[PDB]
Short mmCIF file of C-alpha atoms in Angstrom, two decimals:
data_model
loop_
_atom_site.label_atom_id
_atom_site.label_comp_id
_atom_site.label_asym_id
_atom_site.label_seq_id
_atom_site.Cartn_x
_atom_site.Cartn_y
_atom_site.Cartn_z
CA UNK A 1 0.00 0.00 0.00
CA UNK A 2 2.79 2.43 0.87
CA UNK A 3 4.63 1.84 -2.38
CA UNK A 4 1.37 2.22 -4.30
CA UNK A 5 0.56 5.57 -2.70
CA UNK A 6 4.00 7.02 -3.34
CA UNK A 7 4.08 5.75 -6.92
CA UNK A 8 0.64 7.13 -7.71
CA UNK A 9 1.50 10.56 -6.35
CA UNK A 10 4.78 10.66 -8.27
CA UNK A 11 2.91 9.62 -11.40
CA UNK A 12 0.24 12.30 -11.05
CA UNK A 13 2.79 15.04 -10.45
CA UNK A 14 4.81 14.00 -13.51
CA UNK A 15 1.62 13.84 -15.58
CA UNK A 16 0.55 17.36 -14.69
CA UNK A 17 4.09 18.48 -15.48
CA UNK A 18 3.70 16.86 -18.89
CA UNK A 19 0.48 18.72 -19.65
CA UNK A 20 1.86 22.09 -18.57
CA UNK A 21 5.00 21.57 -20.63
CA UNK A 22 2.88 20.81 -23.68
CA UNK A 23 0.88 24.01 -23.21
CA UNK A 24 4.03 26.09 -22.83
CA UNK A 25 5.43 24.48 -25.97
CA UNK A 26 2.29 25.33 -27.91
CA UNK A 27 2.32 28.97 -26.88
CA UNK A 28 6.01 29.46 -27.61
CA UNK A 29 5.43 27.75 -30.96
CA UNK A 30 2.64 30.16 -31.85
CA UNK A 31 4.79 33.17 -30.99
CA UNK A 32 7.83 31.82 -32.83
CA UNK A 33 5.80 31.07 -35.94
CA UNK A 34 4.29 34.55 -35.83
CA UNK A 35 7.81 35.94 -35.66
CA UNK A 36 8.79 33.72 -38.59
CA UNK A 37 5.94 35.03 -40.71
CA UNK A 38 6.88 38.56 -39.66
CA UNK A 39 10.44 37.96 -40.82
CA UNK A 40 9.36 36.55 -44.16
CA UNK A 41 7.06 39.53 -44.65
CA UNK A 42 9.76 42.05 -43.77
CA UNK A 43 12.22 40.41 -46.15
CA UNK A 44 9.64 40.31 -48.94
CA UNK A 45 8.70 43.96 -48.51
CA UNK A 46 12.41 44.74 -48.40
CA UNK A 47 12.85 43.04 -51.76
CA UNK A 48 9.84 44.90 -53.11
CA UNK A 49 11.53 48.08 -51.93
CA UNK A 50 14.68 47.00 -53.76
CA UNK A 51 12.72 46.43 -56.96
CA UNK A 52 11.00 49.79 -56.49
CA UNK A 53 14.48 51.30 -56.25
CA UNK A 54 15.35 49.44 -59.45
CA UNK A 55 12.33 51.05 -61.09
CA UNK A 56 13.17 54.48 -59.69
CA UNK B 1 6.80 82.14 -53.12
CA UNK B 2 4.34 79.27 -53.12
CA UNK B 3 7.40 77.14 -53.82
CA UNK B 4 9.04 78.62 -50.71
CA UNK B 5 6.17 77.76 -48.37
CA UNK B 6 5.79 74.38 -50.08
CA UNK B 7 9.50 73.77 -49.50
CA UNK B 8 9.26 74.76 -45.84
CA UNK B 9 6.21 72.52 -45.47
CA UNK B 10 7.81 69.42 -46.99
CA UNK B 11 10.88 70.37 -44.94
CA UNK B 12 9.07 70.29 -41.61
CA UNK B 13 7.36 67.14 -42.88
CA UNK B 14 10.76 65.52 -43.39
CA UNK B 15 11.82 66.79 -39.97
CA UNK B 16 8.83 65.40 -38.09
CA UNK B 17 9.00 62.18 -40.10
CA UNK B 18 12.68 61.56 -39.39
CA UNK B 19 11.96 62.52 -35.78
CA UNK B 20 9.26 59.85 -35.48
CA UNK B 21 11.52 57.48 -37.42
CA UNK B 22 14.32 57.82 -34.88
CA UNK B 23 11.64 57.71 -32.19
CA UNK B 24 10.22 54.33 -33.19
CA UNK B 25 13.82 53.31 -33.78
CA UNK B 26 14.48 53.96 -30.10
CA UNK B 27 11.20 52.36 -29.02
CA UNK B 28 11.67 49.13 -30.97
CA UNK B 29 15.29 49.23 -29.78
CA UNK B 30 14.20 49.25 -26.14
CA UNK B 31 11.79 46.46 -26.99
CA UNK B 32 14.65 44.49 -28.55
CA UNK B 33 16.76 45.07 -25.44
CA UNK B 34 13.89 43.78 -23.31
CA UNK B 35 13.51 40.78 -25.61
CA UNK B 36 17.26 40.10 -25.41
CA UNK B 37 17.09 40.16 -21.62
CA UNK B 38 14.12 37.83 -21.98
CA UNK B 39 16.22 35.44 -24.08
CA UNK B 40 19.00 35.65 -21.51
CA UNK B 41 16.77 34.81 -18.56
CA UNK B 42 15.26 32.18 -20.85
CA UNK B 43 18.65 30.52 -21.27
CA UNK B 44 19.09 30.83 -17.52
CA UNK B 45 15.80 28.96 -17.21
CA UNK B 46 17.00 26.35 -19.70
CA UNK B 47 20.20 25.82 -17.72
CA UNK B 48 18.42 25.64 -14.36
CA UNK B 49 15.79 23.24 -15.70
CA UNK B 50 18.58 21.16 -17.22
CA UNK B 51 20.55 20.93 -13.98
CA UNK B 52 17.52 20.19 -11.80
CA UNK B 53 16.19 17.67 -14.32
CA UNK B 54 19.61 16.04 -14.39
CA UNK B 55 19.71 15.91 -10.58
CA UNK B 56 16.27 14.30 -10.55
CA UNK B 57 17.40 11.79 -13.16
CA UNK B 58 20.58 11.06 -11.21
CA UNK B 59 18.62 10.24 -8.08
CA UNK B 60 16.14 8.23 -10.16
CA UNK B 61 18.85 6.14 -11.81
CA UNK B 62 20.54 5.60 -8.46
CA UNK B 63 17.27 4.29 -7.03
CA UNK B 64 16.50 2.14 -10.07
CA UNK B 65 19.98 0.64 -10.13
CA UNK B 66 19.85 -0.08 -6.41
CA UNK B 67 16.51 -1.84 -6.83
CA UNK B 68 17.84 -3.68 -9.88
CA UNK B 69 20.85 -5.04 -8.02
CA UNK B 70 18.56 -6.01 -5.16
CA UNK B 71 16.43 -7.93 -7.67
CA UNK B 72 19.48 -9.59 -9.24
CA UNK B 73 20.81 -10.54 -5.81
CA UNK B 74 17.50 -12.12 -4.84
CA UNK C 1 1.36 -5.78 -7.83
CA UNK C 2 -0.31 -5.20 -11.18
CA UNK C 3 -1.23 -1.67 -10.15
CA UNK C 4 2.24 -0.64 -9.02
CA UNK C 5 3.95 -2.28 -11.98
CA UNK C 6 1.63 -0.32 -14.25
CA UNK C 7 2.20 2.91 -12.35
CA UNK C 8 5.99 2.68 -12.30
CA UNK C 9 6.12 1.68 -15.97
CA UNK C 10 3.93 4.53 -17.14
CA UNK C 11 5.84 6.86 -14.83
CA UNK C 12 9.14 5.87 -16.43
CA UNK C 13 7.63 6.51 -19.83
CA UNK C 14 6.50 9.87 -18.46
CA UNK C 15 9.98 10.77 -17.24
CA UNK C 16 11.64 9.90 -20.54
CA UNK C 17 8.94 11.75 -22.46
CA UNK C 18 9.20 14.86 -20.27
CA UNK C 19 12.98 14.96 -20.60
CA UNK C 20 12.63 14.73 -24.37
CA UNK C 21 10.07 17.53 -24.03
CA UNK C 22 12.59 19.65 -22.14
CA UNK C 23 15.23 19.20 -24.81
CA UNK C 24 12.59 20.18 -27.35
CA UNK C 25 11.61 23.23 -25.31
CA UNK C 26 15.16 24.47 -24.96
CA UNK C 27 15.96 23.98 -28.63
CA UNK C 28 12.80 25.82 -29.66
CA UNK C 29 13.41 28.69 -27.25
CA UNK C 30 17.04 29.14 -28.27
CA UNK C 31 16.16 29.01 -31.96
CA UNK C 32 13.43 31.57 -31.32
CA UNK C 33 15.93 33.86 -29.60
CA UNK C 34 18.44 33.47 -32.43
CA UNK C 35 15.80 34.33 -35.01
CA UNK C 36 14.55 37.27 -32.95
CA UNK C 37 18.11 38.57 -32.61
CA UNK C 38 18.59 38.30 -36.36
CA UNK C 39 15.37 40.25 -36.75
CA UNK C 40 16.54 42.95 -34.33
CA UNK C 41 19.84 43.20 -36.18
CA UNK C 42 17.77 43.76 -39.31
CA UNK C 43 15.72 46.33 -37.39
CA UNK C 44 18.88 48.22 -36.46
CA UNK C 45 19.97 48.06 -40.09
CA UNK C 46 16.64 49.71 -40.86
CA UNK C 47 17.22 52.15 -38.00
CA UNK C 48 20.59 53.17 -39.41
CA UNK C 49 18.73 53.62 -42.69
CA UNK C 50 16.15 55.75 -40.86
CA UNK C 51 18.92 57.83 -39.33
CA UNK C 52 20.12 58.40 -42.89
CA UNK C 53 16.54 59.27 -43.84
CA UNK C 54 16.73 61.84 -41.06
CA UNK C 55 18.21 63.64 -44.05
CA UNK C 56 14.48 64.18 -44.25
#
């Protein structure tokens, strides 16, 4: 019984850790992807600016 | 002339525009400094999580190996 | 016995998974910071350009 109680508690703690880590990963992923899209957009508008310079 | 006042107007336009340009330069620069400090404390967090995770795993492997040798001895 | 075997086994899986998760988290965060720093270097390139534009 003692071993069972300790094991169950350790398991539940680790499980909740797992869930929270997943949520953190998701949020950081969303922010990083938004930054990535921002970077692609800035580079593309930069190139458009370069081509505008080429025009004039 | 009209060209004179037009020139002064586009002039003050350039002045205010470059002013706001340097201004948002400074603002985004402060934001980048804050984000850099964020990355630094982030790497601090990575290192601390790594060391504490490694300590946990060390104790875990010690326990598991002790139990395993107890099993093998039995 | 069945219960505790199950619990310890799934807990070990949890520990290995969570450690893999932590490696993933650190790699993602550091890559995010590297990309963000590249972006800020680009922003300061643009800010030097804006200081030139202070010509207007």
